[PDB]
Design a protein around this ligand. Structure first.
Ligand SMILES: [Ag+]
Ligand SMILES: [Ag+]
Ligand SMILES: [Cu+2]
Ligand SMILES: [Cu+2]
Ligand SMILES: [Cu+2]
Ligand SMILES: [Cu+2]
Length: 507
């Protein structure tokens, strides 16, 4: 039973300069929103068709005025999208927002830079784009979010994020809760700051070192409760915050068992009383409420702040038990002739950088052949006290081999796409790209992302000549935004610009 957070306590966000503590809202407690499942336009055993529509609207979050929000196929966040390993997936990306966006499938092993939906995949106002892909990767929880470069931070803040569930045959065979919305629920962890008339104001809250508001928002709900009607419940934790770290535990120190990470089931279940998640990380846990009587309640906390109340209703006894082993991890081979790649994250605030530079949308920072796993050493250069930087790579699911030459954390033996790197620490990852393209790698503190803590790698088939890709440029991006907002390029405000400008550089 893991009873403490794994990360280095001195580097926790709560020691940040200008740390924003969470405060319990006075808003009335209400049922946790569970995003509906997006209904396919059509579906067979072999093909599924979806239309995913970015849209602007309004959402009742606090008593009083509705908060203006953005969402996918709804006003805030999104309907949950289900993908299936081996199923040919066809998606119409529709943008009905007043500004351009991008549709990034975080953790999905798809081609880049277009299907990947990163910096180079704009979808302009009024436009529809079509993509198709077949996922060949294990069952897991992924997510969809906006990824214009910039500002990913602003678009996520507005509400553009949705859970993506990947199903496969192996997971389906297992005794896990799986009744979506009944005993299997998203827990998208975010925070916001509400201004006058219950509005969000990213610009007013902007901080190049990471934006955090004092009001926790879970699945777009303030002060939620969940009605438990089964002994066991599956929680799909997703850290969807711009910066905040979640340090999760129950009252009574009720234990819970992690069965999944970002990219796969864990090889074996891992039991915990206290679990920490950095930005973009996912943890699927099973909670067993068998020791509670009907009518009782149990609250989930982050640090000393209540997040989510579980109300215990009558439930049937559950006699099932987790197998000793959930999933077999097959590590790809590493060609000994390959170098160990060294990636160095540095800086904070406006001076964030990777390998001595801020992102430049037309600069390739690295290449790697497809189909060849390589060791990546990833270092967080910050001296103590520092912050934990969650490092993320597009177009892959990696394995974690070591932290400072020692074992990874107990819940890091499955496939992952995002890893918290502590000040002074070097983590060794095993990284392979199955598909050619251009893929970002960056910190997932989203203000750091926007502020230039990002690079891109061109993965290539060595049997073919170098491919040419149409990369977005910053002049094109700013022209578009200018037209869209009815202003001149020079008066455009974007999250991340301040970091570039203050360091005298440009994207
Ligand atoms: Ag900092
Ligand atoms: Ag740019
Ligand atoms: Cu992401
Ligand atoms: Cu990503
Ligand atoms: Cu960072
Ligand atoms: Cu990214």
């Amino acid at each position: 039973n893991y009873t403490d957070y794994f990360f280095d306590e001195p580097a926790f966000d709560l020691h940040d300069g200008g740390y924003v503590p969470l405060e319990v809202s006075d808003a009335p407690e209400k049922p946790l929103n569970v995003p509906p499942l997006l209904k396919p336009d059509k579906e067979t055993a072999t093909d599924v068709y979806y239309t995913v529509t970015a849209e602007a609207g309004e959402t009742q979050l606090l008593p009083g005025a509705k908060t203006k929000t953005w969402g996918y196929n709804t006003s805030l966040l999104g309907q949950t999208i289900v993908y299936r390993r081996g199923q040919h997936t066809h998606v119409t990306l529709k943008n009905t927002l007043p500004e351009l966006t991008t549709f990034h499938w975080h953790g999905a092993n798809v081609s880049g830079p277009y299907v990947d939906g990163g910096c180079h995949a704009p979808v302009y106002p009024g436009e529809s784009k079509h993509i198709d892909f077949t996922l060949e990767q294990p069952a897991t929880t992924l997510w969809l979010h906006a990824h214009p470069c910039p500002s990913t931070a602003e678009q996520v803040w507005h509400g553009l994020a949705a859970m993506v569930i990947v199903k496969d045959d192996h997971e389906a065979s297992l005794p896990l809760p799986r009744n979506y919305g009944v005993d299997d629920i998203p827990v998208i962890l975010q925070d916001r700051r509400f201004h006058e008339n219950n509005q969000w104001d990213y610009r007013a809250d902007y901080d190049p070192d990471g934006v955090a508001g004092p009001t926790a928002m879970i699945n777009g709900t303030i002060n939620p409760y969940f009605d438990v009607t089964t002994q066991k419940v599956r929680l799909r934790f997703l850290n969807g915050a711009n910066r905040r770290e979640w340090r999760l535990h129950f009252a009574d120190d009720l234990p819970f068992t992690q069965i999944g990470g970002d990219g796969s089931l864990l090889p074996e279940p891992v039991k915990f009383t206290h679990l920490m998640l950095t930005c973009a990380e996912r943890a699927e846990v099973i909670v067993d409420f068998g020791q509670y009587h009907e009518g009782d309640e149990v609250t989930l906390y982050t640090d000393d702040v209540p997040l989510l109340k579980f109300r215990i209703h009558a439930f049937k006894p559950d006699q099932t038990t987790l197998p000793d082993k959930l999933f077999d991890v097959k590590a790809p081979v590493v060609d000994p002739a390959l170098p160990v790649r060294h990636v160095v994250m540095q800086g904070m605030d406006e001076g964030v950088a990777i390998d001595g530079k801020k992102f430049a949308m037309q600069r390739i920072d690295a290449t790697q052949p497809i189909g060849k796993a390589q060791y990546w050493d990833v270092t967080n250069s910050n001296d103590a006290p520092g912050m934990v930087h969650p490092f993320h790579v597009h177009g892959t699911q990696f394995l974690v081999l070591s932290r400072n030459g020692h074992a990874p954390y107990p819940n890091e033996h499955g496939f992952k796409d995002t890893i918290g790197v502590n000040p002074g620490e070097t983590v060794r990852l095993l990284v392979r790209f199955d598909l050619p393209g251009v893929y970002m790698y960056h910190c997932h503190i989203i203000e750091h992302l926007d502020g230039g803590m990002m690079a891109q790698i061109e993965t290539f088939d060595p049997a073919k000549p170098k491919q040419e890709y149409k990369l977005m440029d910053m002049d094109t991006l700013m022209m578009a935004l200018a037209k869209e907002r009815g202003v001149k390029p020079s008066e455009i405000w974007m999250g991340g610009m301040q970091s570039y400008e203050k360091m005298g550089m440009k994207m």
